[PDB]
């Protein structure tokens, strides 16, 4: 009688893109104090160059 439902693994939306976000899913130690997080192409990813 219970109902189960899972959050879908893949994204949903009109447009879906691949981006570069280092350690976006890291869980263990804090890691090196250095990251690279590009914004989605809808913004000005010019600060990274």
């Amino acid at each position: 009688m219970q109902m189960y439902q899972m959050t879908p693994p893949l994204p949903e939306g009109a447009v879906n893109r691949i981006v570069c976000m280092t350690n976006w899913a890291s869980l263990g130690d804090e890691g090196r104090g250095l990251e690279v997080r590009l914004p989605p192409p809808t913004d000005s990813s010019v600060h990274a160059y």
Partner: peptide, 30 residues
């Protein structure tokens, strides 16, 4: 945060010297 450092002063000086105005008032566009 990201790693970034100021450019050498000499380069910045010469670079800033040559920067023409992008938009100017011209009374003609025909």
């Amino acid at each position: 945060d990201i790693i970034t450092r100021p450019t050498s002063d000499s380069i910045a000086a010469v670079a800033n010297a040559t920067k023409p105005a992008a938009v100017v008032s011209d009374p003609q566009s025909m």
